[PDB]
Amino acid sequence: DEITKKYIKDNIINVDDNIIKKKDIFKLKNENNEITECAFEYFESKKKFDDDIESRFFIINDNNYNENINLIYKDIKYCGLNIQTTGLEVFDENIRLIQIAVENYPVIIYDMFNINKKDILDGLRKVLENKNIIKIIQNGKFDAKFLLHNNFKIENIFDTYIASKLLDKNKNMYGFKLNNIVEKYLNVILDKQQQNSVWNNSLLNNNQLFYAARDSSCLLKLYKKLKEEIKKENLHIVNDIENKCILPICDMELNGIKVDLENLQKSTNEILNELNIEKDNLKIISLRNYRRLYKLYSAFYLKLPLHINTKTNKIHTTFNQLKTFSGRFSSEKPNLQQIPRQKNIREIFIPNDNNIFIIADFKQIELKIAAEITNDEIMLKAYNNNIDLHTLTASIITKKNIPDINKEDRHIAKAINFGLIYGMNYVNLKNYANTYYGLNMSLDQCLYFYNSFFEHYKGIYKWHNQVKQKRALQYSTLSNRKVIFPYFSFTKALNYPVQGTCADILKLALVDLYDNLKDINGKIILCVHDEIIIEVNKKFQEEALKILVQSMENSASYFLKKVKCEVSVKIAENWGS
């Protein structure tokens, strides 16, 4: 009986001689009622850990499997969920271990590479599906993608990453790895060296298992303290929304979006002919033509093929829900917000055969949010009367009546609104209009615009002055998502509550959507700026349309109480429409 080969029957390699197998009796309660006790075999460390985190564990093999283990799940309310995988990309990797930590019990470790009987996993699958049991997870998007891809259904998550990230209020970019969070909230130092280990082999190291186990045990204590701190800072609503938003996000990343390679290769050759022809003719008109076609070609039409899945013609971007200052979503590899906002281009993004796109956008949601949080009477009443805010401003500036307002007046009004709402003076207003709107506006005119604007929009005036006076650094949204600035900045101060509230609305809408989109097996594809794209079988065209609008209007209703939003919708076969 060699040391190393001591536990091959359990797929363990005793490297350090730091492990013992033991068989002891535990205090359970039968499936019927009577408090039954059961004998279990578990592994414990020889050298006692300096910490109080559970370091013993059960291991589940196709070999030794005691159904009584599942009785530990009976009548739990929360558990610590963790998994160890072969790599990072789900489509190309496999789940190695599924660890579940239950209070006052050694960690249950499902050895996936040595399990072929479905019966075993029945216990696990039950837990994961139980809407009434909270699964504590560190970085839940990752683990949830893997499980959902391996057809494990999961619901009710509490993400310690989300909790820690929110509690930080966006004043640090790093320090949200598990060991960091533990050293902060529990003042315990975990061994992170076993992250770099190999989990692809069919035999597991002696120390890798202890690492895995502990990395789940701590989720219980961590959950308690983080729950407490979240409640203290009044972040329950935000934290809850984000946790519930994990699953929708996974839906977007797993579904992906399909590309029509015909318009792609064709358009590539076309812009190639334009770049060559313009290079011949050329070698201000010339510069802008060449640079534009050069970027659209090389900085888009040439990069996109790299992200296509060679087999599915699908792009599976990665969404981030808390790597932004405002709180909005952000995508990468590829960054969907950097795709040209042009019909000719976006028309290459299509639904699947028997499916179709439904696309919904918010209209002037930012200006409405401003009206709400400001409680600006004129804006709120005009909105309730279904009068456009640009028209409203035009009326105030020109002193004309709506029947006498013309397109040029509305254009000037757009400049005045988008400029002055977020805190420009008349000089910056002149430059802003003259630049983005092409208006040869004089300084005297712009000064009139300023005075008139804040003469009538007295709520807005109060908002600006109060901010400018207090010069605070702490700011919140309507979900009470908080942030702390490094230094005071007027424009950013005014901008955060608006953009952050938009992020809250969109995210909650995705949650409601993901819930109400199951009866028709609908898929959520994309969320960009203030628009959402879902994909449904052409059968449920009208039904899905109603569902989408319902989710977005309901979400806006949750946060805004004296303004009503407007959701424009289109049923399209292309992103460009």
Residues contributing to the site for Mg ion (CB under 5 A): 82
Task: Please state at what angle helix 236-255 crosses helix 206-232, rounded to 10 degrees.
Answer: 130
Is the Cβ of residue 82 or residue 417 nearer to Mg ion in the bound state?
Answer: 82
Shortest separation between residue 506's beta carbon and Mg ion, angstroms: 28
Q: Which tokens sit at 132? A: 């009434």
By beta carbon distance, the residue nearest Mg ion is 82
Is the Cβ of residue 97 or residue 257 nearer to Mg ion in the bound state?
Answer: 97
Structural contact between residues 213 and 109, judged by C-beta atoms closer than 8 angstroms? yes
Q: Looking at the chain, after which residues does the C atom sit over 2.5 Å from the next written N, breaking the chain?
A: 283
**The dihedral of CA 447, 386, 466, 500: what is its sign?**
negative
Is the Cβ of residue 136 or residue 275 nearer to Mg ion in the bound state?
Answer: 136
Long-range contacts (CB closer than 8 Å, 24 or more residues apart) made by 564-570: 564/383, 564/384, 565/362, 565/363, 565/365, 565/368, 566/362, 566/363, 566/364, 567/360, 567/361, 567/362, 567/363, 568/360, 568/361, 568/363, 569/358, 569/359, 569/360, 569/361, 569/545, 570/358, 570/359, 570/360
Shortest separation between residue 160's beta carbon and Mg ion, angstroms: 10
Under DSSP, is residue 290 helix (H, G, I), strand (E, B) or coil?
Answer: helix
Amino acid sitting at position 100: I
Shortest separation between residue 61's beta carbon and Mg ion, angstroms: 21
Shortest separation between residue 5's beta carbon and Mg ion, angstroms: 29
Is the Cβ of residue 199 or residue 329 nearer to Mg ion in the bound state?
Answer: 199
Is the Cβ of residue 179 or residue 324 nearer to Mg ion in the bound state?
Answer: 179
Shortest separation between residue 134's beta carbon and Mg ion, angstroms: 17
Could you list the beta-strand ranges (E) of 373-485: 474-476, 482-484
Is the Cβ of residue 174 or residue 487 nearer to Mg ion in the bound state?
Answer: 174
Shortest separation between residue 86's beta carbon and Mg ion, angstroms: 14
Shortest separation between residue 76's beta carbon and Mg ion, angstroms: 20
Shortest separation between residue 300's beta carbon and Mg ion, angstroms: 36
Shortest separation between residue 19's beta carbon and Mg ion, angstroms: 21
Task: Please state at what angle helix 160-168 crosses helix 178-185, rounded to 10 degrees.
Answer: 60
Is the Cβ of residue 82 or residue 267 nearer to Mg ion in the bound state?
Answer: 82
Query: Which one, of 500, 499, 502, 524, lies nearest residue 512 by Cα?
Result: 524
Whole-number Å distance between alpha carbons of 7 and 91: 32
Structural contact between residues 218 and 53, judged by C-beta atoms closer than 8 angstroms? yes
Give yes or no for a cis peptide into 340 (omega within 30° of 0): no
Is the Cβ of residue 82 or residue 207 nearer to Mg ion in the bound state?
Answer: 82
Is the Cβ of residue 219 or residue 396 nearer to Mg ion in the bound state?
Answer: 219
Helices then strands, counting H and E runs in the chain, come out as 19, 21
